[PDB]
Amino acid sequence: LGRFWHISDLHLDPNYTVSKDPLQVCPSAGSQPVLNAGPWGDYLCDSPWALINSSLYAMKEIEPKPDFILWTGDDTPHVPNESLGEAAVLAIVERLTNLIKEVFPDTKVYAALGNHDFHPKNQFPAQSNRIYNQVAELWRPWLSNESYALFKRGAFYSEKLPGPSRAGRVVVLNTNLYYSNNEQTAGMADPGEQFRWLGDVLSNASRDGEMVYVIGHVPPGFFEKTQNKAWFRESFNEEYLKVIQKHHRVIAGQFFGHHHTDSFRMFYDNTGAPINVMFLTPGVTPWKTTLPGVVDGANNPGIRIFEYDRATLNLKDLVTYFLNLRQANVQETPRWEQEYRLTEAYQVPDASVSSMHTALTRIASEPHILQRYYVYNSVSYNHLTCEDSCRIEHVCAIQHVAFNTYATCLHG
Ligand SMILES: *[C@@H]1O[C@H](CO)[C@@H](O)[C@H](O)[C@H]1NC(C)=O
Numbered sequence: 001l002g003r004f005w006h007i008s009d010l011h012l013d014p015n016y017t018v019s020k021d022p023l024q025v026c027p028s029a030g031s032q033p034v035l036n037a038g039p040w041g042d043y044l045c046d047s048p049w050a051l052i053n054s055s056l057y058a059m060k061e062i063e064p065k066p067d068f069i070l071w072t073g074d075d076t077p078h079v080p081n082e083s084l085g086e087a088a089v090l091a092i093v094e095r096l097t098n099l100i101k102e103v104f105p106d107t108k109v110y111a112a113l114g115n116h117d118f119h120p121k122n123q124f125p126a127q128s129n130r131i132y133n134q135v136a137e138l139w140r141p142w143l144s145n146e147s148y149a150l151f152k153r154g155a156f157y158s159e160k161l162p163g164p165s166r167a168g169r170v171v172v173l174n175t176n177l178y179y180s181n182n183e184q185t186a187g188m189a190d191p192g193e194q195f196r197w198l199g200d201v202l203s204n205a206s207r208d209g210e211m212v213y214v215i216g217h218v219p220p221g222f223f224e225k226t227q228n229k230a231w232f233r234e235s236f237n238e239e240y241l242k243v244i245q246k247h248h249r250v251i252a253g254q255f256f257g258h259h260h261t262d263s264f265r266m267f268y269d270n271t272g273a274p275i276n277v278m279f280l281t282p283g284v285t286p287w288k289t290t291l292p293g294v295v296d297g298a299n300n301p302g303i304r305i306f307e308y309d310r311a312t313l314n315l316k317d318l319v320t321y322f323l324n325l326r327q328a329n330v331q332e333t334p335r336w337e338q339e340y341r342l343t344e345a346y347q348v349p350d351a352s353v354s355s356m357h358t359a360l361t362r363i364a365s366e367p368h369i370l371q372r373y374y375v376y377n378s379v380s381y382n383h384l385t386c387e388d389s390c391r392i393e394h395v396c397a398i399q400h401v402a403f404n405t406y407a408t409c410l411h412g
């Protein structure tokens, strides 16, 4: 039984300070007063360095020897571009990289850039640039030579699983190329030829008898905390769905972030059969989001471990851990606790496609399972009841990655 960590959306705020001025605690809160900020963070702020360091050492305490770590980006704070140049972005990425290397010196990391890991934010080019080159240098110890060249060109690559094993491969995507706010790829059908490349990779895996873990930052489909918010341009969404529908037999799981909230996405074929599942891991940052439509969109800091079969890559379980920031901010040393274990939370035998489909049906049909899922969705920050509209938003987001099916589900 192997284990691997998944962390995402650390969103370091370099300027977080416990200030008596509510408006000078953290630039990531904008003009929102931050009253009684604590040393481990604030729900209105991105992560202080203390919080990120705490998350890494909590991972080390819980499991110091993972098979590997998946890290899906977003290292910089939610601030105006003018406050955050390219040098600062690269320095922040390097500092988080070096922290992971120092806490887990000998552990392979599969790292994907998040939409904030660029200057200007979200403007990911479909070609090589200074940031891709420097980050390729930073992550070079985890990259094969082919992966190094590929990352320099488009920040995507495919790496063997650690050790001698030829079971399994991790495909690291740069899905920031598909975010609608990315003007660098507007008018591009297959930016960086990623989709084509991905198809080839998956084909090779089927030829070679490998299973694949696909990771990326920005997921296809919709954001469960509001209605009709998708990140991918529609054509990119459709292409990603086509890729999954063709190659689901070699994909043992998908792992993404960018929501900061805990949810999952099911993929179905045209017969209704469940064919794949994507796990949206929560963020370390607790930052209350400024996205229109979302109310009280903060979360507790979360980290996640997966238990998997090394021979087959079958996902056996996941365990999500969290820091109750309200409690941690009055304590000498913050202690992370198990938030939940998937199989226990949803009464399913594993984290496979069938099990995740069962979990979705339970969420959609049983009020206490829906409430359990909803509390975990904010990493146990928001304990209010998920009523009918909330239920529909979450069920439709989980069940429908396609635009048309999601909207029709929303009609309900
Ligand atoms: C990071 O956390 C570890 C473990 O709690 C602690 O020993 C160390 O002092 C922390 N480092 C910083 C810079 O806060």
Ligand SMILES: [Zn+2]
Binding pocket: 009, 074, 114, 115, 116, 217, 257, 258, 259
């Ligand atoms: Zn993001």
